[PDB]
Amino acid sequence: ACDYTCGSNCYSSSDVSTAQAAGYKLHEDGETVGSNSYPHKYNNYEGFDFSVSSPYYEWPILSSGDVYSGGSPGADRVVFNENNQLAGVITATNNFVECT
């Protein structure tokens, strides 16, 4: 169902756990993909109230259901921490708002 609503895009908790696992795996290998080299630290300058502690890492979640593997990241991102805990799902307005 829509556990997370990012504008036009509805994501289930299952869609989120698949994206997060691909981002965490790369984070553990010290590997990055794309121009902007994701996953990368997310500093939470928006001051969102996450349930888990930082440091935070951001990885793109794609509306198509594909796994991010380069090119355009789109507007949505999964935020997770160093302990592979999900902090939240955000969407762009560089500047973001939380998904509902």
Q: Which residues are CB-contacts of 75 (< 8 A; sequence separation ≥ 6)?
A: 6, 7, 91, 92
Structure obtained using: X-ray
Q: Tokens 């990885």 sit at which residue? A: 59
Give a three-class secondary structure readout of the chain: CCCEEECCEEECHHHHHHHHHHHHHHHHHCCCECCCCECEEECCCCCCCCCCCCCEEEEECCCCCCCCCCCCCCCEEEEEECCCCEEEEEEECCCEEECC
CATH of the domain at 37: 3.10.450.30
Backbone angles phi and psi of 52, in degrees to 5: -130, 160
Residues spanned by the domain of 94: 1-100
Report CA Rg, the chain: 12
Q: Backbone phi, then psi, for 16, in 5-degree steps?
A: -65, -45
Domain count, the chain: 1
